[PDB]
């Protein structure tokens, strides 16, 4: 389908067991917002968009409830055919050209995620790093898998080595993607 | 054992809202079994899993689903995307690096890193002594950073001699093009 | 200004 622009609205995922749900909008392939289902709050990727635009979370909660129902009907109708675990693929790259001493962001792009449950974590000199890290929602792919990005903000140094570590049910061992200046 | 269901609502826009197509998809695990497509005008089963679903959705929901082309696609675009997504403009940063240590008469690659821009439409050109380079230019795919910015790297195969190389960037966010020079 | 969901409709079972 050719178009100048594409909006993804009402996008809903529900998974069992675990009652895992997600509701997002996207425009031209970037995340507008997700609905925090625990807090019943709309969380916009660019905060200035949400200062101008209202999305009432109830619309997301309604779609989640409808997808929970639909998950129930389709699992039974399929005779409880389970999801096939895919093997995710990860790549690490910097947001901007790397200059020693100048702040930057490492981006761990993880693709072919299915089911949408994953653990993406960063290591610096083989030690876990969690402060400041943030990640996107599960963003949809045309083949109905997902992708997700994790961000590590850092100052490049010659004495620091980084890994993005990816754990998923479809991997026998964790995937480790290395990066250094 | 794990079980997943997805719903995808998709609004395709051409020439603003002059042309809109709405597609909704019902997905079990990764199998799309049921679809509404405004170019078709009704729900259709995509696989046998959706065989009896399509008749029920057409009977119960079809008028609301068609109406959403206007009440959701057209509304969301004209009222909310026009003043946010469609007016976002982020200017590219441009830097030039050499892939290998510079050596006279030795093959090298000049890399024009063009980063942090939005929207995706961009034009990047290499020049040598004011002469546009055609052959020996390559580009990465446009890289979506996920933070509503893009980057692209544009490479030029070259060999340092004696002179001046210029990366030239045009983007909707720029009144005038950006030029960055490198001297051999 | 408010953006609206495309609604998930319920399967009949
Ligand atoms: Na209806
Ligand atoms: Na140009």
Residue numbers in the entry:
A (entry chain A): 2 to 182
B (entry chain B): 5 to 166, 168 to 189
C (entry chain T): -1 to 11
Published text:
T-cell specificities recognizing hybrid insulin peptides (HIPs), which arise from the fusion of fragments of insulin chains with peptides from other hormones that are exclusively expressed in the insulin secretory granules, have also been implicated in T1D initiation and progression. Thus, the I-Aαd/I-Aβg7 pair conforms the murine major histocompatibility complex class II (MHCII) molecule I-Ag7 that is uniquely expressed by NOD mice. More recently, we have shown that the 4.1-TCR is also antigenically promiscuous, recognizing seven different I-Ag7-binding HIPs that result from the fusion of various chromogranin A and/or insulin C fragments, including post-translationally modified peptides.
The sequence of the agonist HIP39 antigen lacking its three last amino acids was fused to the I-Aβg7 chain through an Asp>Cys mutation [LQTLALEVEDDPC] to enable covalent linkage through a disulfide bridge with a concomitant Ile74Cys replacement in I-Aαd. The structure was solved with a resolution of 1.8 Å. The HIP39 epitope is tightly packaged into the peptide-binding groove of the MHCII molecule through a nourished net of interactions with both the I-Aαd and I-Aβg7 chains. As expected, the negatively charged Asp at the peptide’s P9 position and the Ser at I-Aβg7’s position 57 stabilize the I-Aβg7’s Arg78 side chain through H-bonding. The most obvious conformational change involves I-Aβg7’s Arg68, which switches the positioning of its side chain from an initial arrangement away from I-Ag7’s peptide-binding groove, to a locked and HIP39-oriented conformation in the presence of the 4.1-TCR.
